[PDB]
Amino acid sequence: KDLGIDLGTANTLVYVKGKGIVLREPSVVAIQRDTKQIVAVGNEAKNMIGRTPGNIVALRPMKADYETTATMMKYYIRKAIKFAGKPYVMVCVPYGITAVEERAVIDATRQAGARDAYTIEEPFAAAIGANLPVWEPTGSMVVDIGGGTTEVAVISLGGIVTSQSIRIAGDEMDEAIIQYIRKSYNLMIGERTAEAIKMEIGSAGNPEGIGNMEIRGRDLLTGLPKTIEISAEEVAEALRDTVYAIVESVKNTLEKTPPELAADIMDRGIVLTGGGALLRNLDKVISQETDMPVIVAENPLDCVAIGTGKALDHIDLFK
Numbered sequence: 052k053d054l055g056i057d058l059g060t061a062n063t064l065v066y067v068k069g070k071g072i073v074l075r076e077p078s079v080v081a082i083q084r085d086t087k088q089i090v091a092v093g094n095e096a097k098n099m100i101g102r103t104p105g106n107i108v109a110l111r112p113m114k115a116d117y118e119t120t121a122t123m124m125k126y127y128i129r130k131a132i133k134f135a136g137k138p139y140v141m142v143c144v145p146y147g148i149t150a151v152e153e154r155a156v157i158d159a160t161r162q163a164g165a166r167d168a169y170t171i172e173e174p175f176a177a178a179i180g181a182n183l184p185v186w187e188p189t190g191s192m193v194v195d196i197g198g199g200t201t202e203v204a205v206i207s208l209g210g211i212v213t214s215q216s217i218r219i220a221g222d223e224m225d226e227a228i229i230q231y232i233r234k235s236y237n238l239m240i241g242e243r244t245a246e247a248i249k250m251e252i253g254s255a256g257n258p259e260g261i262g263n264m265e266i267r268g269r270d271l272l273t274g275l276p277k278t279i280e281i282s283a284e285e286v287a288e289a290l291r292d293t294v295y296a297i298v299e300s301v302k303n304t305l306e307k308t309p310p311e312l313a314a315d316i317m318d319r320g321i322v323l324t325g326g327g328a329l330l331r332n333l334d335k336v337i338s339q340e341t342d343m344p345v346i347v348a349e350n351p352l353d354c355v356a357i358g359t360g361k362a363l364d365h366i367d368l369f370k
């Protein structure tokens with residue numbers, strides 16, 4: 052029974068042909084500090100972390116190493132198959148991926164127990180998962196904003212016409228908030244607080260009425276913890292350059308798009324997928340700066356994984 056696997060920078064999802072998303076686990080491993088060997092993956096790692104056995108540290112590999120990939124894929128595949136035979140595995144990969152890296156991904160999935168492994172670029176999977184008409188001779192456009200990358204693509208006739216990837220996404224919005232608070236308040240906050248600010252009062256623009264938030268961090272003069280209040284308006288300033296860079300990759304992908312496909316997209320709209328697509332008003336801001344309709348996909352966190360699974364029905368194209 053064939054599997055689609057989305058090993059995301061923070062979240063891993065496994066799709067099983069005929070069952071849907073059957074596995075939702077963090078992209079994390081636990082490694083024994085001294086032996087440097089992986090001893091748990093995903094939920095087994097997170098729970099081992101909560102048992103606290105010492106001599107063990109958690110890592111986020113997808114934030115790269117062939118054996119880590121193989122070990123993680125072996126866990127997720129074995130965990131997902133609740134067994135009819137060695138599976139055929141569709142592996143979602145970032146659009147940037149090079150040939151040597153793509154073959155390293157296939158070989159490690161084979162090592163993990165796949166009969167054979169195929170890859171699908173993330174924007175293509177997201178477009179399939181967002182129900183864009185990717186097989187028709189008309190233009191479609193998806194912007195997938197994850198934790199590590201923003202991937203923009205124009206799809207037509209079952210393939211990517213043009214596509215761009217930038218390393219400016221969810222994690223970079225967090226960093227922009229950290230850096231803004233550092234410069235403005237001489238206060239250093241951690242990544243957990245930055246993430247919460249982004250989710251609770253973050254916006255791409257027009258932050259009126261979103262509200263304010265009390266946050267805590269380290270005063271950089273005294274080194275002592277300090278509490279301040281930050282506003283939606285400030286957070287939107289903090290995120291301005293990140294948002295501008297996403298807008299610019301959408302524009303730059305359009306400028307590389309043939310004219311008729313560009314016309315189809317202006318008519319049907321751009322679809323935003325991924326967790327970063329939930330930044331408040333990002334759809335409106337991309338719409339305003341490009342003069343195009345922009346909508347956030349239904350089920351934006353699962354589009355990629357569902358698209359990876361639906362690609363199993365078209366295994367011939369990826370073989």
Ligand SMILES: Nc1ncnc2c1ncn2[C@@H]1O[C@H](COP(=O)(O)OP(=O)(O)OP(=O)(O)O)[C@@H](O)[C@H]1O
Pocket residue numbers: 058059060061062063196197198199200220221222246249250253324325326327328329330331351352
């Ligand atoms: N409400 C929200 N507002 C803004 N960002 C959010 C929200 N919810 C989640 N995110 C962001 O979504 C990102 C993770 O999204 P997603 O699960 O699609 O990524 P991923 O698949 O793990 O990563 P990648 O696609 O880069 O491999 C994180 O940066 C997270 O902060």
